[PDB]
Design a binder for this molecule. Structure first.
Ligand SMILES: O=C(O)[C@H]1O[C@@H](Sc2ccccc2)[C@H](O)[C@@H](O)[C@@H]1O
Ligand SMILES: O=C(O)[C@H]1O[C@@H](Sc2ccccc2)[C@H](O)[C@@H](O)[C@@H]1O
Ligand SMILES: O=C(O)[C@H]1O[C@@H](Sc2ccccc2)[C@H](O)[C@@H](O)[C@@H]1O
Ligand SMILES: [Cl-]
Ligand SMILES: [Cl-]
Ligand SMILES: [Cl-]
Lengths: 579, 579, 579
C-alpha cells in the first residue's frame, strides 16, 4: 500500500489488454434498492452459469474495454459518461512462499475500489497518481479475479472540482502492473545533488519488511562510485558522496546508470545531476542563466485524443516540442504518466510538474485539503529523482480568498519541506497598477521562488492589437514565468487576421503577443497554451471547436498552424541570445 | 403560469419538430469559470455571425433533436447522458392586442429553465407534470427565440431521487404548445358526479383575468342540460345539476359532449360519469362489485422504447391490454401524458395514477415534500374530470420509518382534501405473521381506501415453487390490491421451466402465482409487473436483459410471451365470475 | 497531370483539414433516375441559398470529414461503408501571372473524380498512388470550389479485386497539396549510383514546359560535385559523375544534400548511395553479405488503426521495428505514403515495396493489366531515388495459371526495364518434393532475382509442432526470401502453448518456426507477418479478433507480445553473425 519507487525496473508482469466491463450508472452493483451495500454485488465476479438462481449481471458475457485507456473514446455511448464502470480481469500467478506480490495502478480517474477474489483491497481517490495494494496473502492457485469499480462523477469537494476546461476521461487510464518483491525490499530511495553543490551527490534509501538492517551498496560505475552503508533499525540509511558528475542540461541530457543493492534486493535506475537556483530575476541551471523556452501539454494523444500513457505517446508530443524549439515543457494540469517525464528527461526537456488544484476548489474542506496534499506528496515521491524537473506548481488559477490563501500556503510549505531544491510555483493573481500597465498581487508569492501567472491578452482580454498596449511591472525581483497565453484556431480554416479562429488571427496574435513579451522586465520563462488541440466540454462552436479547445499550436491531427512558426522563430532568437 | 384545463381543446399552435441543441455537461452556457451566472450565456440565442468577436457557441450551426422526445434514444452519445442539454426554437406569432398567449410544456425531465427573447420566463422541477408561462407581453414581431435549458442529473433531494429502476430519459419529453386565450378566459373547471350520487352532477368553473364576473352556461346537449350560473368577484362559480346520465363502464365507456361558455370564452370536453366506492372488501363501480383485471404500464413506446407521448403510442399499448383481458391499467411510476389517459378513458380501462415518490425519498427535506405535493396537486388538477381514473397513489415501495410515515400521511391527506370521490392508495409495508403466511402491517393504511402492496413471490422471494406455500391474511377488511408481481423472460429464449429468464420459467411462475392470488382473502385488484419490457439501467445480464427490465408479458417488440396467456386465461374467468 | 518528383520540396500549400462531405450510396449526385449523367449534380457545389428552387443537397450545411484519412474510423456509420462520398473544399489562391498551379493527391481509394469550379479535371483509379491535375487556367479570383467524388466499391476487374485480407479504407487517405511551378519546371529527375559501381553517379533530369533547352546544374556540396549540362529539344539531359560517396547502409544511413537548378527552377533533395546485387544465394549491399532482418507492415496507424500518412505514424511504427532488431521493412500490400519511405530511409531500414496485385486478379482483362502496370510505373517513378528500397515486388499470393504467368511476367519485365539496379521479387508457387520436404516450383522465378514466397507452417498448415516436421530445398541457387510467416495472438490473452490465439501459442509457434528457418539453405531474408495487428473484414472470432488480423508481434495498442522477443533474439544473433 505504500508507493514503490521505479516500478518499471522491478520484477513486473503486465495485466493490460482487454478486460470485461459493466457500465453501471445507478451503481446497482454496489447498493441495493435501500441504497445499502449488499453481498453479491458485482465485486464477487460470479459467472452466471447456474440459471436456476437469480442474478442481474454476468462479467463473462459482457463487453470489453482496453486497459489502459479512457473509456470515453472507446464507445460512442461512453463519450460523455460520468459514473461507474466495473472492470474485471482474470489472471494466474505462481508465488513462492516468502516472496511478496503487489498490484500497481499507474492511474485511475477518479475513484477506484479494488477487489481480489471477492475481498476488498482498498480505495483510491485522485485520478492521476499511482497506488499499490499488496496481494501476497490473497493470491489463490488457479484463476484469480481482479475487480475494479471505477467512478468519475464530478464531486464538489474533489480535486479537481465540478468545473474545469478539459475532458472528464474515466477509467483505468494507465498500465496495471504486478510486482514481485523479496520479503524485505528496497521500497524507496533518493539520489540527487545536494542543494547548489555540484560536487556532492547525496541521498538515502528505505527498505521495507522485517530484516530492516542490511548492507546497502550504491554503485555508479561511470563515476567510479561504490558507496556502502547499513540501514538503521527503521530500514533507513542516508549518505553523502563526493563526485564531479557531468551535469544534465537540455542540450546534453546526461544520465548515469545507478545500481542499488541490498542483501536481499536490488534495482537499477537512470539518474542525471544538475543544480537549479534563482538569483534575482535570473534562473540558473548548473550556475548558468537560462531562459525556459517552454510549451504546455495535456496528457492527451496525437490523432485520436485519448488519454496518453505510453512512450510512443510521449515521444510524438515531445518531438513536436523539439521542432518548436523548446527546452522546457509544462505538463498540465496534473501529474502525467511516468513515461512522459522519462521521455522528457531522455530527450533534454526541463519540466514543470503540477497538481489539479484548479478554480473553485473547496478551501474549507479538511478532506479536500488532505486530498490535494496527498496528490502533492505522491507527485514528488514518484519523480523526485528526475533532474529535468525544476518547477513544482501547487496551484492553477484560483479565486482569491483567505481560505484559498491558507490552503495554498500549506501546499507551498509542504512542497518545500519535501524538496528543498526545485522551485515552487503557483498561478498568482493579477492586478492593474495603472491603465495599460499590469502586475501581480498575491501574498502567496512569498512562499514561491518565481512570479508565475496566466494571461490571455489578445484572446480573452482584448483583440490582438491590445498586446501592443499592455505592459508589465513588478515590485519584486524574482524571475517572471508566464505559464499560459494564446488563442484558438482550426487548422485549415483561413481568412482575415481579424477573423477569430482562423489561422491568420492566431498568427497575428502571436506576433503581437511575442512583441509584448519582449517588453516584460524579468521575463525568464514562457509555456504558451498549448502544444496540441485538446478535448474540452466547454467548447461548443460547431465545425470550429466541436468539443475541442483550439489553442493548440499543433492541431489534434498533428498539423502545424501558422502561429507555430511565430513562436518557433522567437525561440530561435532566444536560443542564440542565451547561448 | 397557472395550470390550464383541457389544453387540447383550446386555440393551439404546435412548436413541435426538430430544434437546435447544445450538449453542455459542465454547464458552460450558464456558469463561468468562477461558477457564477453570467450575462451572455446560451439563453441569449446569439447567432455567431460576426467572427471578429469571441463567443463559445452557436445554435445556428449546431445539431438537431426531435421534440417531443427523450434524448437518450436519439444519439448513441446521449444514451446514458445525465446533465444539461440546451434546446432552441425560433417561431413567429401574430397576437391580436387584447388577446393573451401562453406557452405550455406537457413535460420536461427534470429541471427546465425557459427563456423567450433572452428573458427568463421561469423554472420547473418534476419531469412528468405540465407547466405554463404567459408570454403575452414578451412576444416580438418577426422572429422569436425560445431557449430551454433541460437538465436531468439525479439529485439526492429530488423526486424521484438518485436510485430507481427505470431509464433516466432526459429532455423535452412531451409536446410544446402555444395557447391563445381571450383577455379573460375559462382557466379551470370540474364536472363529475357527486359522491356516490348517480343522479347529481356537481362541478365548478374558474375564470382568469379582469372580467371576473360573467354569465356562464353549461351545456350537456345529449342530457338536455343547460345550467346558467354567474361568477363571484373571484371568477368562481359552482353548480349542482340533477341529471340521470348513462354511467361510464369499461364495457360501455360512455362519454358526453360537454360545453362551457362564459361571456368571453367557450371550451368543449368529453367527460363521463360514474360512481366509485369501497364496501368492505368489495370495490363498487356504479353500485356493482367489480374486480380490477389490470396490468402495469411504463410511459415507454412499443418497438423503439422511447418516452411515449402520442395517441398512437397509447393505442398500441392499450390494445395489448385489451387483448390481455384487462379492464384496468396502472400507469407507473408518474403521471403519464394526457393522450394515454384519454385513450384509456375512451377504450374502457379504469386507471391507477401515481407520483414518483419512490424508495429513498428525503423524508425530512421540506423542499422534497413541497415538490412531491406539487406533483400530487398537478396530477389531480389535470385529470380530475377523467371518470376512468379511480385510484390515486401517493407512494410506491418505500422503507419503514417515522419520517416516511409522516411525509406519506401528509400526501394522503392532501389527496383526500383535493378529491373526495376517488380511492387513495400506496405501496404498504408487509410482514410475516407466521411462516408461509404474510400480511400488511403499515399505519399508513389507516389513511387509504385499499390494502395495496407489491410482492414478487417466486421471482425475488424464492423460486416459482414458493408461490405454492405462501398465504395472506388481513386484520382490516378493505379491498386488497396487488399493484406489482411477476418475473422476467426474454421472448424467444426457451428451456426448462426451472431456468430463470426463459419463457417456460415465467409461464410456470404465473401459473403458480395465479393459484396463490386465488387464495388471497378479499383480493379485488391485480396490476402485474409489467405489460411491456422497458429500459432500466439496473438490468445487466448480457443477451437476456441488455439494459431492459424483462418482466413484461409482452416483449419490447410486441411479442406475447407464454406467461401472457396464463394471465389472460385467469382474466377470462374473472370476467365470467364477476359478470 | 504527369507525375512530379519530390513534391515536398516544391512550393506547396496544404489543403488539408476538414471538408464538407455527402455520403451518397446510390450516386444520386451523379446519375438521375434514368441512370444517366445530368447537369447540376453535386460536382457543381451549389449552395442551397434560394429555397424557391429545388435541389436535393447542400454541402454548406452538411457534415465534415477529416482530410487526409480513411472515412471508416471517423463515424460508426462509415465503418463498413463501400460506395461514394463527395468531398468539397473552398479555398483562395493568388497565382502570379505566368506561374502554374497543380492539385496533387497523395492518394484516394479507390476511384476519384475531380472538379474545380464545376469543371471536370479528370479521373483516377488505384488507391495507393499519387496523381496530379493542372488548374493554372481554371483558378478564379476569390472563392474556388474543389469537389472530389470518392468511391471504394470493390470491383471484380480492379487491382486489388473483390477479395483481400485488409479493411476497405475509403476516402482521401493522404495529404492534398497545391504546387506552384515556373512556366518551365524540373518535373522529374534520377540520381543514383550506376549499377554495381561504387565510384560512379549516374542520372538524368526532365523538364516540362516550353523553354525546353536550358542549362542545368547539379550540386552535391559535401562531395564537391558541381555538374552542369544542357537539355535537348525534349527537355531531357543525362549525366555521369565520377565520385566516391560514403555509401548508405542500415547502420549508417548517410544521406547527401543534392541541389538541382535550371534557368527557371530549382529543387533540393536528400539522396543516399549504395550498390545492391545478388551473388549466388547471397544478397550483397555495397559488396557486403547481408541478412535482411525484416518485418512486414501495413499502412495503418498505431493505437487507433486508421490509414497512416504522417511522419509521426511512420516514426512510431519504425521505432517498433528498430526495437525488434530489424534492418529491413516490407511495406505491404501497396505503395505506402512517401513519409513512410523517407523515414525508413533516414532511420536505416532497407525496404521492400510492392503493388496490390493479389489473389484472384482478372489476368485476362487488358484494362486490369494496364491498371496494374500503371501502379507499378507510379510506384517506381516516385521512389527511384530512395536508396533504401532494394526490392520491388510485382505480386503477392496468386493462383497457378497460365494467364497469371503471362500477366506477372509482363509486370516483371516492365519493372526490370524501369530499374535495372533493384531486385525484383514476387510470391512464388510452392510444391511438395516429398513428405516433409517443400520447395518452390514457379516458372515466374526465371524473371526474379530472389526465391521469394509466403508460408504459414504451424498456423494455417499444422500446429506449431509441424514446423519441426518440415524442411525446404531448392533447385536454383538464388537467395531465398520468405516474405510472410507467423500466426495470431491477442495481447493479454494467456493459456497453454497448445491453445490458439494465446500469447503462449504464438511464442511456441515462433520458437519452432525460427528453428525451421535455421535449417533453410540459402535463406537471405525474412519479413514475418506482421508488425502490428491490423483491421481486416475476414477476422470474426469475437473478443479475440473483432475485425483485426491478430498476427502482429505488437498489438494494435503498442504492446509487445511474447513472440516479439523470440524474433528479437534471433535477429540479435543474426546481427552478430553477419557483423
Ligand atoms: O480557456 C482556456 O483556454 C484556459 O483558461 C485557463 S484559466 C484563465 C483564463 C483567463 C485568464 C487567466 C486564466 C486554464 O488554465 C486552462 O486550463 C484553460 O484551457
Ligand atoms: O425490480 C423490479 O422489477 C421492480 O421492483 C419494484 S420494488 C419491490 C421489489 C421486490 C419486492 C417489493 C417491491 C419497483 O416498483 C419497480 O419499479 C421495479 O421495476
Ligand atoms: O491470412 C493472413 O494473415 C495473410 O495471408 C496472406 S496469403 C497466404 C496464406 C497462406 C499461405 C500462403 C499465402 C496474405 O498475404 C495476407 O494479406 C494475409 O493477411
Ligand atoms: Cl478555443
Ligand atoms: Cl428482469
Ligand atoms: Cl489472425
Amino acid at each position: 500500500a505504500p508507493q514503490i519507487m521505479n516500478v518499471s525496473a522491478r520484477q513486473t508482469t503486465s495485466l493490460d489488454g482487454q478486460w470485461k466491463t459493466i457500465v453501471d450508472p445507478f451503481e446497482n452493483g454496489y447498493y441495493d434498492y435501500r441504497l445499502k451495500p449488499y453481498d453479491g454485488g458485482y465485486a464477487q465476479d460470479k459467472t452466471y452459469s447456474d440459471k436456476t438462481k437469480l442474478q442481474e449481471y454476468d462479467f463473462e458475457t459482457d463487453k470489453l474495454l482496453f486497459v489502459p485507456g479512457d473509456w470515453n473514446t472507446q464507445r460512442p455511448q461512453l463519450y460523455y459518461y460520468e459514473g461507474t464502470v466495473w472492470y474485471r480481469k482474470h489472471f494466474e500467478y505462481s508465488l513462492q512462499p516468502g516472496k511478496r506480490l503487489f498490484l500497481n495502478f499507474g492511474a485511475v480517474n477518479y475513484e477506484a475500489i479494488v477487489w481480489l477474489n471477492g475481498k476488498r483491497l482498498g480505495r483510491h481517490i485522485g485520478g492521476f497518481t499511482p497506488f499499490n495494494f499488496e496481494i501476497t496473502n490473497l493470491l489463490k492457485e488457479g484463476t484469480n479475479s481482479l475487480v475494479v469499480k471505477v467512478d468519475n462523477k464530478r464531486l464538489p469537494e474533489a480535486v479537481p472540482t465540478v468545473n474545469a476546461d478539459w475532458w472528464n476521461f474515466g477509467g483505468i487510464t494507465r498500465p496495471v502492473t504486478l510486482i514481485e518483491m523479496p520479503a524485505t525490499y528496497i521500497r524507496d530511495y533518493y539520489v540527487q545533488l545536494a542543494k547548489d553543490d555540484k560536487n556532492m551527490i547525496e541521498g538515502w534509501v528505505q527498505l521495507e519488511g522485517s530484516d530492516k538492517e542490511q548492507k546497502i551498496t550504491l554503485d555508479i560505475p561511470e563515476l567510479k562510485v561504490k558507496k556502502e552503508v547499513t540501514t538503521d533499525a527503521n530500514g533507513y540509511a542516508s549518505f553523502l558522496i563526493k563526485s564531479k558528475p557531468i551535469l544534465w542540461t537540455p542540450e546534453n541530457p546526461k544520465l548515469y546508470a545507478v545500481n542499488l543493492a541490498s542483501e536481499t534486493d536490488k534495482v537499477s535506475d537512470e539518474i542525471g545531476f544538475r543544480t537549479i537556483r534563482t538569483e534575482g530575476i535570473k534562473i540558473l541551471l548548473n550556475d548558468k542563466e537560462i531562459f525556459c523556452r517552454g510549451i504546455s501539454i495535456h496528457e492527451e494523444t496525437p490523432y485520436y485524443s485519448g488519454r496518453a500513457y505510453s512512450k510512443d505517446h510521449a515521444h510524438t508530443l515531445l518531438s513536436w516540442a523539439k521542432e518548436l524549439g523548446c527546452n522546457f515543457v509544462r505538463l498540465a494540469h496534473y501529474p502525467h504518466n511516468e513515461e512522459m517525464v522519462r521521455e522528457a528527461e531522455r530527450m533534454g526537456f526541463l519540466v514543470w510538474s503540477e497538481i489539479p488544484v484548479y478554480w473553485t476548489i473547496h478551501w474549507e474542506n479538511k478532506d479536500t485539503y488532505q486530498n490535494a496534499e496527498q496528490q502533492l506528496c505522491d507527485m514528488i515521491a514518484r519523480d523526485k529523482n528526475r533532474c529535468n524537473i525544476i518547477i513544482w506548481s501547487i496551484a492553477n488559477e484560483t479565486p482569491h480568498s483567505k481560505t484559498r490563501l491558507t490552503f495554498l500556503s500549506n501546499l507551498a510549505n509542504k512542497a518545500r519541506s519535501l524538496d528543498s531544491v526545485r522551485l515552487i510555483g503557483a498561478a498568482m493573481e493579477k492586478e492593474e497598477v495603472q491603465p495599460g500597465v499590469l502586475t501581480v498581487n498575491d501574498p502567496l508569492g512569498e512562499l514561491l521562488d518565481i512570479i508565475s501567472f496566466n494571461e490571455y491578452v489578445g484572446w480573452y482580454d482584448g483583440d490582438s492589437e491590445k498586446c501592443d498596449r499592455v505592459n508589465w511591472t513588478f515590485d519584486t525581483q524574482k524571475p517572471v514565468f508566464i505559464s499560459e497565453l494564446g488563442g484558438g484556431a482550426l487548422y485549415g480554416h483561413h481568412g482575415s487576421p481579424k477573423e477569430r479562429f482562423t489561422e491568420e488571427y492566431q498568427e497575428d496574435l502571436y506576433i503581437r503577443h511575442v512583441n509584448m513579451l519582449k517588453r516584460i522586465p524579468g521575463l525568464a520563462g514562457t509555456t504558451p497554451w498549448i502544444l496540441k488541440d485538446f478535448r474540452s466540454p466547454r467548447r461548443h462552436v460547431p465545425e470550429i471547436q466541436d468539443d475541442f479547445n483550439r489553442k493548440g499550436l499543433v492541431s489534434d491531427k498533428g498539423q502545424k498552424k501558422k502561429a507555430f512558426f511565430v513562436l518557433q522563430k522567437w525561440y530561435k532568437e532566444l536560443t542564440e541570445a542565451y547561448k
